[PDB]
């Protein structure tokens, strides 16, 4: 039994998942997020209570307004860096792709559906057919090159073109489609199979820019994905998941939204620590 597995049983048998989450809530440091509250940036924020911190926000270089609701989450101890962001709005899709270009991002991890429970959580920022998607404000175009449809996720191969310079890069768009907002995946196997699919593409390696992780607000499901991956990388080199989460929350507010998402993170980390990947793929029923 590992130290993490010992802590998991103590939390479960004593039902301390909710006070542990409250502890993380109470220990979460607040940081200035003034730029996000500028009046000119109102139409760039999906939610009024979810903002990037000033010290860690991703800046749109050379634009008139450099603001995008996106946070660079660095974990120097893991040699890992992610960009967590909200689901783009119709008017910020151009900024989203400008950020992907400037940050040399190779993968976009999307953990939400476009519509969830009668509500639009994200604009359609990539094309679903062979028609080019134009973003004239920032000078980019996106084409759908290929798509690999699994039972609970789809991988879209996208071509991101700088329409001014002509340069193109290939973007891997990993779309998790069965993860409800404020909820959890179906099982640790399905989540880990998806995560290792992202890992196996090489898009998280240091020879690429930071991956862009997003859901609706960019804190809940996105926080779960990044917490498990960061803890798995560290466990490779004893980890304190609580401290890892608190340190990650210094870069973006509110990561992990429910005690159940915290509990699931523990389960995914414990199951991911055994790495079995073929076993996960079969349990996930991806095909």
Tokens of 22: 């409250």
- Residue 96's contacts (CB-CB under 8 Å, 6 or more residues apart) are 68, 85, 88, 125, 212
Number of domains the chain is built from: 1
**The one catalytic residue among 93, 94, 122, 215:** 215
Residue 258: phi and psi, rounded to 5, are -135, 155
254: containing domain = 3-284
Resolution, angstroms, 1 dp = 2.0
Q: Which residues are annotated as a binding site?
A: 181, 215-221, 257
Q: Where are the alpha helices (DSSP H) in the chain?
A: 3-13, 17-27, 93-102, 188-200, 221-236, 241-249, 259-272, 277-284
Tokens of 39: 């009046």
- C-alpha 156/C-alpha 280 separation (Å) is 21
- C-alpha 34/C-alpha 278 separation (Å) is 47
How determined? X-ray
Q: Which residues are annotated as a binding site for substrate?
A: 181, 215-221, 257
Radius of gyration over every alpha carbon of the chain, rounded to an integer in angstroms: 18
Active site annotation includes 275: no
The CA distances from residue 159 to 39, 57, 132, 137, 215, in Å, are 34, 26, 10, 18, 21
CATH code (residue 133): 3.90.190.10
Q: Taking CA 92 as the corner, what is the angle to CA 87 and CA 96, rounded to the nearest 5 degrees?
A: 70
């Amino acid at each position: 039994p590992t130290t993490i597995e010992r802590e998991f049983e103590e939390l479960d048998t004593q039902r301390r998942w909710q006070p542990l989450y409250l502890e993380i809530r109470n220990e979460s440091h607040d940081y200035p997020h003034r730029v996000a509250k500028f009046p000119e940036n109102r139409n760039r924020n999906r939610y009024r209570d979810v903002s990037p911190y000033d010290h860690s926000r991703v800046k749109l270089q050379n634009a008139e307004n450099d603001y995008i609701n996106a946070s660079l989450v660095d974990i120097e101890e893991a040699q890992r860096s992610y960009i967590l962001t909200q689901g783009p709005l119709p008017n910020t899709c151009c900024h989203f792709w400008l950020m992907v270009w400037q940050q040399k991002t190779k993968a976009v991890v999307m953990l939400n559906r476009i519509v969830e429970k009668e509500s639009v959580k994200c604009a359609q920022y990539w094309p679903t057919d062979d028609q080019e998607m134009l973003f004239k404000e920032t000078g980019f175009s996106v084409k759908l090159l290929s798509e690999d449809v699994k039972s609970y996720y789809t991988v879209h191969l996208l071509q991101l073109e700088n329409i001014n310079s002509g340069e193109t890069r290939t973007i891997s768009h990993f779309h998790y489609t069965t993860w409800p907002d404020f909820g959890v995946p179906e099982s640790p196997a399905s989540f880990l199979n998806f995560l290792f699919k992202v890992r196996e593409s090489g898009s998280l390696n240091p020879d690429h820019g930071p991956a862009v992780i997003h859901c609706s607000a960019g804190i809940g499901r996105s926080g779960t994905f990044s917490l498990v991956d960061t803890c798995l990388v560290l466990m490779e080199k004893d980890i304190n998941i609580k401290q890892v989460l608190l340190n990650m929350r210094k870069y973006r507010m509110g990561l992990i939204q429910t005690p159940d998402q915290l509990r699931f993170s523990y389960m995914a980390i414990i199951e991911g620590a055994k790495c079995i990947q073929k076993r996960w793929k079969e349990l996930s029923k991806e095909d």
